Ligand binder design. Structure first.
Ligand SMILES: *[C@@H]1O[C@H](CO)[C@@H](O[C@@H]2O[C@H](CO)[C@@H](O)[C@H](O)[C@H]2NC(C)=O)[C@H](O)[C@H]1NC(C)=O
Ligand SMILES: *[C@@H]1O[C@H](CO)[C@@H](O[C@@H]2O[C@H](CO)[C@@H](O)[C@H](O)[C@H]2NC(C)=O)[C@H](O)[C@H]1NC(C)=O
Ligand SMILES: *[C@@H]1O[C@H](CO)[C@@H](O)[C@H](O)[C@H]1NC(C)=O
Ligand SMILES: *[C@@H]1O[C@H](CO)[C@@H](O)[C@H](O)[C@H]1NC(C)=O
Ligand SMILES: *[C@@H]1O[C@H](CO)[C@@H](O)[C@H](O)[C@H]1NC(C)=O
Ligand SMILES: *[C@@H]1O[C@H](CO)[C@@H](O)[C@H](O)[C@H]1NC(C)=O
Ligand SMILES: *[C@@H]1O[C@H](CO)[C@@H](O)[C@H](O)[C@H]1NC(C)=O
Ligand SMILES: *[C@@H]1O[C@H](CO)[C@@H](O)[C@H](O)[C@H]1NC(C)=O
Ligand SMILES: *[C@@H]1O[C@H](CO)[C@@H](O)[C@H](O)[C@H]1NC(C)=O
Lengths: 370, 214, 346, 50, 198
């Protein structure tokens, strides 16, 4: 730690000791159902972008590796999460929105976009934490005579709020002459259909879009992954996986006053203090494992190689496993220097009126004194 | 109708999240009822226009000891066209409906414990908020007009309904008397005690003294 | 604001004013000497037992050795400041059991054996007046590891690698230095500040002080009882002022509050996101792949390193100010306790 | 700018530290001027005879 | 038609607070100190003011420096003429050369150039495409403008922290000089100093 081969006399803070975890536990709820992504992707027909569907997925085990078999897409477009890490963590509520748009309009299914779909048809929130799946469908959404069943809106008085619908069919009145249903030169119907032919280029072909929305939250989890659980162990430095959060610490029983709706606790530094077990409704504190600082008291390297090691701040019944003589000091536990009843000048300072020195006894050794 | 006006005092405090905090002074920005605001007092007497605009959150309160309030109806319009929420209480269970059938083809149904647990004055408080398609319901039962003090409201009931709400009314089984308060985006300073509940709060945009406190 | 009362001295070229009586008065001067010694670990603060964050921190640079060296130098400077101010006497002197110092009481400043810590009445009042926080290793890793219904800031800063080192000299040794200095001052005068301590009666020492300030020594020997009563009343007024008013020690209290608020700000800077998706490294490492979590972890590492460097620079500036105040206090101890000073208003 | 204000609020709490440091500096200079010049308890005046 | 730097720093949030004591109050303090010194001597720094003729006061000063007081009373007119000529020479030296107040002028210049470079740091791109936020909002969408705004925020925060650190160091130096000035006022105006070259 000094980047040298010779060490002078004094005290040096070298490193920090830690207690390593022993076991690893996983705590997931008691859910055995399977999430029907099959009914979402394997479907005969989809809905229009102005009347997009929304399927609630809840109380099931979600496997996201079977999505690739249902539809022939290229890759996920995930915001906030990664598509390969969707099985090691889990949410509370998952939705699925299905609609059919054009190939130029796929880029408007991103958060923060402004356009035609992203203003008047389907607006995503700027804090989106989900994935967008889109693939070409030119064999089931196109006809040689014409597939006119897919509709979109060009005219609206205002812009859509995120995650809202408007399926009303009223005649838009852009002009100053009221018509109340007369499609004249100033009134137009704001509902036009795509003229899908198979003989287009790659940009104007229909595309099927499935948008997944995730709700990682302090609510109890209902949609989770295929990972088995582990029996709970207390009063031991372990690694825990309580509903998708990973940490290292000691779990003890609590005398806290958690309300029935509250499921987590937090610290001033915004780290988790208490967590609720999903299987049995009990509260466990998260206390980090034993740590501290290690200081090395040595004389000169030309003098001797005897080393006294001080663990800063702990008592000697808390040490995990240096030297042989064990002394208690208000600065910490000093191991390797015997305590004499005499008093001399301070050679190497330790703290709280305690000094150390390399002196004889009759046989050279390190002593500690007031 | 008998429209009247009353100070709000400090009766618009609710829990902003589901995270336990103890002995921590916390600052939150959410739709809150401002301190010393103006609530509207209504006296519905039937031998009146109960249509009121939503305007981003509604604080509801009633001082009636007897169970004479059955529930509420919401929605933009009530001509059996769009989805309109409906709460029916009969002192045995709660009934929630979404379909456009008004008070005498439904997607979401919800049956749970009734909202009137208690049968003193038994002041009841309700906060209805519609943010991100969720109908958040906050309630608190205070055995004691609006008194002086604090009573935080717990998010015990949530609805994934996802509709548009502009108007709202109440349901009667007339000597009703209820207060209506409106929510505005404000910043508070909530104080948690050792037991983890909210006991004091400071509205940061009321007077310069509370701005100094925040 | 009013600058003061209006006055006009009656000046003439054949008029003088000469006092006919005196007044013995005792004042109080409070000076900071040392401050809290802190030790900061980078791996617990920036990363907190995360292996990926530790690897990117090792890949980043070597700022942490510089911060550790700066904080170690500040701690040794604090110990040197305390040793320079207080340890100025070669031998621990002792008062005789007879406490008749020419009619002067000296009981409120001399120690008593009733308390386990040999401190006087005024020292006890001064120690009880300061609400000391972060006194050293008082938690001793036992209260923080247990279950507390209301966690304090001490365990919160303890779990994030922010520790406080105890001072080298305990309060008993500081009280022993102060008692030795007081015993040498009463029993010797200024003779113990040059060589060996030479005894002298206290009335003759006070006559030497009056000859030092320009007054002939016959004034004291004819007015000894009045001067002793004035000194006793001044000591009693000092006792009453230190018992009633609690705003006099607002330099030491400000030092304690500044160290506490600096540590609290350093703890509260851990909750910031710094442009990342979250302020927790575990949520970032679970929610993302390798490259994106590397980007967010690098952003959080940069933000926490900037916060730690700001804390270290502010601590260095405060340590320089405290060292200047300790040098002033050591000069005052050398010039006014160990001798009579001719400097005006010093 | 609203977006810059939101990102600066999302950034951290350096600005309260900067404001606290500058306020302490200004109070320190006022204390410096007071402790240099205000050393006399009463405002004396010279007689008209000079 | 020609905007000054004061409006340029005022429009960017950089203000200057007035001192608590105005120049009239400082002049009154120095006038009270001068009146007490030339009327009473050092007696107004210990207790109440004690009047004394100025010849006896200068005899006290000569007895302080080690000269018997009969030297003054036999050479009073010569010493008075020498003092008046010395004050006239101070007047001539202050009217001729303006470089005596270089420390105060350097303090003013340092503060002015610190505020000027803090204003001039706002014209830097810091790696972004533009140094102005409005063109970043207008040209780009949300995602790219967030990155460019974050870069500009980091650069301006670093510049502000550098300014605050330099101001802290300069304030510590100014406080040390103020402590020296207060010690000089306490020991040399309120009394006679035996320290060499103080
Ligand atoms: C020196 O001062 C102490 C403190 O005031 C005196 O002790 C007090 O004595 C009176 C009368 O004996 C008691 O009523 C008080 O309770 C004592 N106070 C304390 C704090 O002990 C002491 O008497 C003084 N010395 C002399 C010689 O009078
Ligand atoms: C000088 O001042 C002291 C007090 O500062 C005077 O002492 C007081 O004298 C009165 C009248 O005899 C007594 O009632 C008080 O008890 C005395 N006080 C003390 C503390 O002893 C003293 O008389 C003054 N001397 C002259 C010559 O005026
Ligand atoms: C819930 O989980 C516990 C875990 O042991 C299990 O015993 C229990 O049967 C589960 N409940 C249901 C309804 O499956
Ligand atoms: C999707 O799943 C159904 C089973 O319900 C299957 O018959 C069909 O061939 C699959 N593929 C498509 C493109 O529909
Ligand atoms: C350390 O452990 C011992 C044994 O339990 C205990 O008595 C003591 O109080 C603890 N703390 C210190 C500072 O010694
Ligand atoms: C509410 O507003 C009305 C006027 O609209 C006013 O008369 C009444 O005093 C207000 N209530 C208060 C301030 O409590
Ligand atoms: C049922 O409700 C839907 C809208 O939710 C509506 O379109 C439909 O017409 C309703 N059915 C009948 C028979 O009214
Ligand atoms: C609700 O309907 C109104 C029209 O009554 C419309 O202006 C508004 O955009 C809709 N959506 C909301 C408030 O989210
Ligand atoms: C917390 O709850 C306990 C349990 O009844 C109670 O004794 C205590 O007074 C409560 N604390 C406060 C501050 O009211």
């Amino acid at each position: 730690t000094l980047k040298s081969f010779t060490v002078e006399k004094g005290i040096y803070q070298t490193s920090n000791f830690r207690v390593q975890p022993t076991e690893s536990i996983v705590r997931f709820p008691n859910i055995t159902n399977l999430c029907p992504f099959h009914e979402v992707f394997n479907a005969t027909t989809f809905a229009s972008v102005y009347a997009w569907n929304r399927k609630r997925i809840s109380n099931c085990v979600a496997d996201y590796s079977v999505i690739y078999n249902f539809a022939p897409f290229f890759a996920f477009k995930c915001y906030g999460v990664s598509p390969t890490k969707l099985n090691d963590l889990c949410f509370t509520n998952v939705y699925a929105d299905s609609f059919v748009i054009r190939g130029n309009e796929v880029s408007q299914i991103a958060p923060g976009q402004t356009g035609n779909i992203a203003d008047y048809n389907y607006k995503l929130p700027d804090d989106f934490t989900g994935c967008v799946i889109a693939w070409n469908s030119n064999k089931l959404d196109s006809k040689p005579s014409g597939n006119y069943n897919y509709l979109y809106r060009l005219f609206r008085k205002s812009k859509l709020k995120p995650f809202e619908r408007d399926i009303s069919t009223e005649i838009y009145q852009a002009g100053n002459r009221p018509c109340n249903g007369v499609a004249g030169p100033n009134c137009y119907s704001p509902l036009q259909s795509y003229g899908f032919r198979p003989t287009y280029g790659v940009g104007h072909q229909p595309y099927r879009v499935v948008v997944l929305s995730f709700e990682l939250l302090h609510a109890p989890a209902t949609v989770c992954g295929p990972k088995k659980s582990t029996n709970l162990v207390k009063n031991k430095c372990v690694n825990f996986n309580f509903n998708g959060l990973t940490g290292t610490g000691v779990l003890t029983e609590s005398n806290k006053k958690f309300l029935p709706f509250q499921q987590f606790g937090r610290d001033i530094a915004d780290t988790t203090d208490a967590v609720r077990d999903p299987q049995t409704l009990e509260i466990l504190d998260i206390t980090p494992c034993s740590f501290g600082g290690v200081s090395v008291i040595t004389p000169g390297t030309n003098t001797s190689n005897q080393v006294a090691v001080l663990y800063q701040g702990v008592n000697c019944t808390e040490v995990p496993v240096t030297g042989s003589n064990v002394f208690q000091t208000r600065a910490g536990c000093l191991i390797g220097a015997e305590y004499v009843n005499n008093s001399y000048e301070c050679d190497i300072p330790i703290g709280a009126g305690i000094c150390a020195s390399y002196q004889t006894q009759t046989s050279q050794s390190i002593i500690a004194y007031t | 109708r008998t429209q009247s006006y009353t100070n709000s005092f400090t009766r618009g405090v609710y829990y902003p999240d589901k995270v336990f905090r103890s002995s921590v002074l916390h600052s939150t920005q959410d739709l809150f009822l401002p301190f010393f605001s103006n609530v509207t007092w209504f006296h519905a007497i039937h031998v009146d226009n109960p249509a009121l605009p939503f305007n981003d959150g509604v604080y509801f309160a009633s001082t009636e000891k007897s169970n004479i309030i059955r529930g509420w109806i919401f929605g933009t319009t009530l001509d059996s066209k769009t989805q309109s929420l409906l709460i029916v209480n009969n002192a045995t269970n709660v009934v929630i409906k979404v379909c456009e059938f008004q008070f005498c083809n439904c997607t979401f149904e919800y049956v749970s414990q009734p909202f009137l647990m208690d049968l003193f004055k038994n002041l009841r408080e309700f906060v209805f908020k519609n943010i991100d398609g969720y109908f958040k319901i906050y309630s608190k039962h205070t055995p004691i007009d609006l008194p002086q003090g604090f009573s935080a409201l717990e998010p015990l009931v949530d609805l994934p309904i996802g509709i548009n709400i502009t108007r709202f009314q109440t349901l009667l089984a007339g000597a009703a008397a209820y207060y209506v308060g409106y929510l505005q985006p404000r910043t508070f300073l909530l104080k948690y005690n050792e037991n983890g509940t909210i006991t004091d709060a400071v509205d940061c945009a009321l007077d310069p003294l509370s701005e100094t406190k925040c | 604001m009013s600058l003061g009362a209006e006055n006009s001295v009656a000046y003439s070229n054949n008029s003088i004013a000469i006092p006919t009586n005196f007044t013995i008065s005792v004042t109080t001067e409070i000076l900071p000497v040392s401050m809290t010694k802190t030790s900061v670990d980078c791996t617990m603060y920036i990363c907190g037992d995360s292996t990926e964050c530790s690897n990117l921190l090792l890949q980043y640079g070597s700022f942490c050795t510089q911060l550790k060296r700066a904080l170690t130098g500040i701690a040794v400077e604090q110990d040197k400041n305390t040793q320079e101010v207080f340890a100025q006497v070669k031998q621990i002197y002792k008062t005789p059991p007879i406490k008749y110092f020419g009619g002067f009481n000296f009981s409120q400043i001399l120690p008593d054996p009733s308390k386990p810590s040999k401190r006087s009445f005024i020292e006890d009042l001064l120690f009880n007046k300061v609400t000391l926080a972060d006194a050293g290793f008082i938690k001793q890793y036992g209260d923080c590891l247990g279950d507390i219904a209301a966690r304090d800031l001490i365990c919160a800063q303890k779990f994030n690698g922010l520790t406080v080192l105890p001072p080298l000299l305990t309060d008993e040794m500081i009280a022993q230095y102060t008692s030795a200095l007081l015993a040498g001052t009463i029993t010797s005068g200024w003779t113990f500040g040059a060589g060996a301590a030479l005894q002298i009666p206290f009335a003759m020492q006070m006559a030497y002080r009056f000859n030092g300030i320009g007054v002939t020594q016959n004034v004291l020997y004819e007015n000894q009882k009045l001067i002793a009563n004035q000194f006793n009343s001044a000591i009693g007024k000092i006792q009453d002022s230190l018992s009633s008013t609690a705003s006099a020690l607002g330099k030491l209290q400000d030092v304690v509050n500044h160290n506490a608020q600096a540590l609290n700000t350093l703890v509260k800077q851990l909750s910031s996101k710094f442009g990342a998706i979250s302020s927790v490294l575990n949520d970032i490492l679970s929610r993302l792949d390798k490259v994106e979590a590397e980007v967010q972890i690098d952003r959080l590492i940069t933000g926490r390193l900037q916060s730690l460097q700001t804390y270290v620079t502010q601590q260095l500036i405060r340590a320089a100010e405290i060292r200047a105040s300790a040098n002033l206090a050591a000069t005052k101890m050398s010039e006014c306790v160990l001798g009579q000073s001719k400097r005006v208003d010093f």
